[PDB]
C-alpha cells in the first residue's frame, strides 16, 4: 500500500545507457541524410501546421525538439555549436552519434563507462593537437582579396542549381560580404528577399535595403517613385481617417452639424498629415496603413508613402538611412530623418518592390532573388547561403584545414598509429575513436551517391603516402587534394565540433539512471 516512488519513473543500469544510445541513434539517423553538399532534404510538419523543408541541421534539430531526455543532451550540445561557432552543427550530431554506437559493443562486453569515456577524452585531446598542427595561416598567399573570396563561393556553388551560373551568383556573394565591415560580420547583415517570376539570372544586388512594398492600397499614377536625396520618416501612428474597427456615432439636430463633425475628423487627420509635411519628409513609412486620403494628400505634396511595413523591414530601412521612428506626428524632430543615395520602385517579377540604394549610413545589404517557383528561389537561396558563409569565414578565420574528410583522415591515421603503443582497455577505445571519425567521409560519399567503400579505401591508402590533404571530390567521384581545390573549413570549427561531439558523448555515457518526475 505504501510505495517508494508514487508512480514516478526510475530506471538504472547498463540497459539504461544502451537505451540512451538508442535514443542518440534515432537523432543521428534523422540528420544522416543531410550531410554533404549533395545531401538530401528533411521535411518537417510543425505543430503550428507549418511545413518546412531544409538540410540545415540547425533548423532541423530546432524544429524536431526530440523529447527523450538522452536526445535532449545530444541536441542541446549541437545547438550550442550553432550559437558558439555558427557551423559544424551536423558534424557534432553525427560524430557524437557514431561514438555512442561504438560505445554499445564495449558496454555489452562489460567495459566500464569510465574507461570508455577516459579513452575518448585522451584520444580526442590528441586529435585537437593534430588539428591545430594542420592549421594553415592563409591571407593573400597566391590569392588576392578578390580571388580568395570568389574561389571560396565558386567552390561552395559546385554541383548546385547555380553552378553553371556561378559567374553571376559568386559576384553577389562576394560583394555582399565585402560591403560589410570586416571587423564585425554577421549573417543578419545580408538580407534576402524572394521575388516570384522571371529568371534567377535577373536577380538584383542592393548596397542598401529593400522591402516587399506590403502597401497595397489605392493611389495609381501618383506618389513619385524615384528620389535623388529623399528624407525618410518612419511612424507608428496609422494615418487613415476611418478605422476597420474603431468608429463614432454622430447624432445632431442640423445637417450643418452632421457635416461639421465629419469635417472635424477630416481636419484632425489633416493636421497630422500637415505636420508630416512640416517635417520635410520625402518618404513616409509606417508599420500601419497610410490611408487613401493621406496618400492623396502626400502625393499632391510629391511625397511617397508606404504603410503596413513589417517591423523587420521598417527597422532595416531606418538602420540604413540613419533616421528614427517616431510614434506621433506632433513630436517629430529633424534628427528623425535619414537619407539614401537613391530611392526607386522596381517592376521586377511583375510586382512592385520598394528599393533603397547606396545608403551612406547602412551597415547591411540585400539580395533580391527571382525565380519561377518557391523551389527555385529556395534552392538558389540555400546555395547562396552556404556560399556567403564560406566567403564570410574567409575573412574572419585565417587558420584553416582541408575539408572533405581530409582533416578527419589525418587524425584517424595518427590515432591508429598512436594506439600501437597503448595496452589495456584504452587501446580498444582509442581505435574506436579513430574508426568513428570515418563516419564523416563515409556519409559524405554515401549521401552523394558515391561508392563509399571504394573511396574510403582509396583515402586510407592514398593518405598513407604522406599527402595529408586527400579527401572526397564531389566534382567527379574520386579523391584529390581538397586544399589545392579550395575545399576548406576553419581550424576552430574542427576543434570545436569535435570537442562538442566529445562532450555530448561523455555526458550521456556518464548516466546510470533516468528519473522522470510526474505530476
Amino acid at each position: 500500500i505504501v510505495v517508494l516512488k508514487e508512480g514516478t519513473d526510475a530506471s538504472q543500469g547498463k540497459g539504461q545507457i544502451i537505451s540512451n544510445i538508442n535514443a542518440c541513434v534515432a537523432v543521428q539517423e534523422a540528420l544522416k541524410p543531410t550531410l554533404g553538399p549533395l545531401g538530401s532534404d528533411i521535411l518537417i510538419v510543425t505543430s503550428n501546421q507549418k511545413t518546412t523543408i531544409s538540410n540545415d541541421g540547425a533548423t532541423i534539430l530546432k524544429l524536431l525538439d526530440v523529447v527523450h531526455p538522452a536526445a535532449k543532451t545530444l541536441v542541446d550540445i549541437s545547438r550550442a555549436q550553432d550559437a558558439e561557432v555558427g557551423d559544424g552543427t551536423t558534424s557534432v550530431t553525427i560524430l557524437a552519434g557514431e561514438l555512442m554506437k561504438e560505445a554499445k559493443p564495449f558496454l555489452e562486453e562489460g567495459i566500464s563507462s569510465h574507461l570508455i569515456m577516459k579513452g575518448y577524452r585522451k584520444a580526442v585531446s590528441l586529435a585537437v593537437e593534430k588539428i591545430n598542427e594542420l592549421a594553415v595561416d592563409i591571407t593573400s598567399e597566391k590569392s588576392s582579396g578578390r580571388e580568395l573570396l570568389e574561389r571560396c563561393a565558386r567552390t561552395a556553388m559546385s554541383s548546385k542549381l547555380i553552378h553553371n551560373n556561378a559567374d553571376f551568383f559568386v559576384k553577389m556573394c562576394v560583394d555582399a560580404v565585402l560591403s560589410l565591415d570586416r571587423n564585425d560580420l554577421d549573417d543578419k547583415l545580408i538580407g534576402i528577399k524572394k521575388i516570384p517570376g522571371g529568371a534567377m539570372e535577373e536577380s538584383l544586388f542592393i548596397n542598401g535595403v529593400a522591402f516587399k512594398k506590403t502597401f497595397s492600397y489605392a493611389g495609381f499614377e501618383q506618389q513619385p517613385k524615384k528620389f535623388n536625396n529623399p528624407k525618410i520618416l518612419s511612424l507608428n501612428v496609422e494615418l487613415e481617417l476611418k478605422a476597420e474597427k474603431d468608429n463614432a456615432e454622430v447624432r445632431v439636430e442640423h445637417v450643418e452639424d452632421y457635416q461639421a463633425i465629419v469635417d472635424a475628423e477630416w481636419q484632425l487627420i489633416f493636421e497630422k498629415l500637415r505636420q508630416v509635411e512640416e517635417t520635410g519628409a520625402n518618404i513616409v513609412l509606417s508599420k500601419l496603413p497610410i490611408g487613401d486620403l493621406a496618400t492623396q494628400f502626400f502625393a499632391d505634396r510629391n511625397i511617397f508613402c508606404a504603410g503596413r511595413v513589417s517591423a523587420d523591414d521598417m527597422n532595416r530601412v531606418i538602420q540604413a538611412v540613419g533616421g528614427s521612428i517616431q510614434s506621433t506626428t506632433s513630436d517629430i524632430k529633424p534628427e528623425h530623418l535619414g537619407t539614401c543615395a537613391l530611392f526607386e520602385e522596381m517592376q521586377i517579377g511583375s510586382e512592385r518592390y520598394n528599393l533603397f540604394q547606396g545608403c551612406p549610413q547602412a551597415k547591411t545589404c540585400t539580395l533580391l532573388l527571382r525565380g519561377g517557383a518557391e523551389q527555385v528561389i529556395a534552392e538558389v537561396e540555400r546555395s547562396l547561403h552556404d556560399a556567403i558563409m564560406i566567403v564570410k569565414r574567409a575573412l574572419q578565420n585565417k587558420l584553416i584545414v582541408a575539408g572533405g574528410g581530409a582533416t578527419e583522415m589525418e587524425v584517424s591515421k595518427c590515432l591508429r598509429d598512436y594506439s600501437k603503443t597503448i595496452a589495456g582497455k584504452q587501446q580498444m577505445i582509442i581505435n574506436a575513436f579513430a574508426k568513428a571519425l570515418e563516419v564523416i567521409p563515409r556519409q559524405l560519399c554515401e549521401n552523394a551517391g558515391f561508392d563509399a567503400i571504394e573511396i574510403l579505401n582509396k583515402l586510407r591508402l592514398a593518405h598513407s603516402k604522406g599527402e595529408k590533404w586527400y579527401g572526397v571530390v564531389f566534382e567527379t567521384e574520386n579523391i584529390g587534394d581538397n586544399f589545392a581545390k579550395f575545399v576548406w573549413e576553419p581550424a576552430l570549427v574542427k576543434i570545436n565540433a569535435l570537442n562538442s561531439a566529445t562532450e555530448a558523448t561523455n555526458l550521456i555515457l556518464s548516466v546510470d539512471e533516468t528519473i522522470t518526475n510526474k505530476g
Binding site: 582497455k425 528519473i515 510526474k518
Partner: protein
Amino acid sequence: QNPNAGLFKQGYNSYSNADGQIIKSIAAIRELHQMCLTSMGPCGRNKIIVNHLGKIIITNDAATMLRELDIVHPAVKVLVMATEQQKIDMGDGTNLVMILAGELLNVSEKLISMGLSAVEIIQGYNMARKFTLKELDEMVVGEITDKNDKNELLKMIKPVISSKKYGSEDILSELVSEAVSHVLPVAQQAGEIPYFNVDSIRVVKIMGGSLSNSTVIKGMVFNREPEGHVKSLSEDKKHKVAVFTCPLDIANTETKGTVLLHNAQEMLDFSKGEEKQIDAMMKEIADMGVECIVAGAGVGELALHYLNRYGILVLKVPSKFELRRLCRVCGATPLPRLGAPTPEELGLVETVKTMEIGGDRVTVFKQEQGEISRTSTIILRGATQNNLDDIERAIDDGVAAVKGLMKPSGGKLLPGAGATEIELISRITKYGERTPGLLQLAIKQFAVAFEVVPRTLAETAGLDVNEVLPNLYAAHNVTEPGAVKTDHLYKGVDIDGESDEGVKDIREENIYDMLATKKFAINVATEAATTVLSIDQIIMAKK
C-alpha cells in the same frame, strides 16, 4: 472462498514482521540505495532528472536524486529524512549517510536470517558506534590550523570539489579559495564572533565559453545596467548610496497616493507639480552628497532627467533579496516612501562600475583595499546550460564545506579515499572479537558495512573490486613493532583511468576528510539503520 486472517485493521495489505516485513523494508530501501551507490566517488555516475517544469538535469548530486522522488514507504523515509539532516547540520556527508545506512541494513539481512533479533542487532550496532566514534578521534593525522590562508583553504577545498567535478578541480578550487579568502578574515583564540556567513559567497552564471573564462568579483554583481546617463562612479572614496523601493517620480503617499485629473486646470497644475516636486526631491539627494541611487522599482523620465543633471548613478535592482543583501555591504536602508530621503538611511560604496561578461553587461558594487565587502561573487561560464548549472552546485559544496572549518572542531583531518574506512574495518572487527556474547555478531557486521566505500571508489573507477579490495586490506593488514600504528596510514583507493599496480598515498594528493563530517555522518547513518531495523509493522488508515 479463501478466508483471511491476521489482518483486523482494515482492508489492507498486512505489513507484519511475521511474514518477514523486516526484510521487505530493507529490500524496499535497496532500490534507493543502488541509486545513490553509483554517485559517490571521484568517478561517480550522473543521473538524468526530468523536472515537473520541463527542466532536464544531469547531475551527480545525490540529494537531488532523493528530493525529486515522491516517497511514502516509512523505511526509506527514515533514511531520506536522515539525509536531509546531514544537509542541514553539515556541509558534506550526503552520500556517506545514505550509502552506509543502507549497507548497515544490507548486512543485517544475514543477522536476521541467522535468527538474531532486531534488539540484539541494534544493541551491537550501538556498541560498534561507540567504538567507531572513539577511534575516529584517535585516527586523526592532520589538522587545519585556522589560519585561513589560500594554501590552507585549497587543501580542504580540493577533495570537496572532487566526487562532483573531477578534472575541473584546478579551476574550481581557485574560484572558491579566492572567494573565501576575500570574505573570510584571519582570526584565532576567540569564539564569540561567528565567521563565514552562508551568504558570504554568491555564485552567478553567464552563458557561453567554458569554465576557463571564470573569475571572481570582490563584491556584488547585479544583472541590471545603470538606467541613468552615468554608467560608473569616480575613483573617489566613500560614495554615499541612497536606496529606494518606491518608484522614483512625483512625490506621493506611501499607500495609494494616486492623483485623478478631471479638470483642465488640474492637468496643468499636476504637470507642473511633476517637474517641481521631482527636482526638489532629487536636489536634496544631491545636496547630501549622494553619488549613487539604487531603486527597487522603476525610475520615471523626469526622475532620470534630474538624476542625470545631478550626476547620480542610477541603478535598478528588481530583486528585493539582492537589495537586502546590498544593505549588508553598503549599510543603506531602502526607503519605502517617496520624497523622504532621510540621511540616516544612506550607505557607502567605494566603486560601482559597469562591466561586460560574455557580452552581457552587469553592474558591480565593490571595494579595493578599504571598507571591504563581506560578500563576494564567483563568475561561472559555460555554453552548455546543464554543465553551467552543475558547476554552480560544485561551487556550493566548496562554500558549504568551508563552513565546517569554523569553531566546532573543524580542524581534525583523516586520510581519505577510503583509507579511514579500511582502518575502521580492522579496528571495529577487533572490538567485536573482544566484546563478549552475541554482541560480536552485529559489531563484526557493522565493520563489514564500511567496505562499501573502498568498494564504490574502485567500482566507479572501472577497477575490478575483487582485485583492488584484497590489496587495500593487505596494505593496512600489517603488524608493526609498537602499540601505535604509523609509518604508513595513507594507503587509499586509486581512481585513475590508467592501470597502476598497488595503491597511491593520500599524502601525494592531499585528500583528507573532516573528522566532524565522518563522526556526524556515521552517527546519523547508525540512527537511520537502527530505526528501520526496529520496525515490525506499518500502520495506515484508509483515506
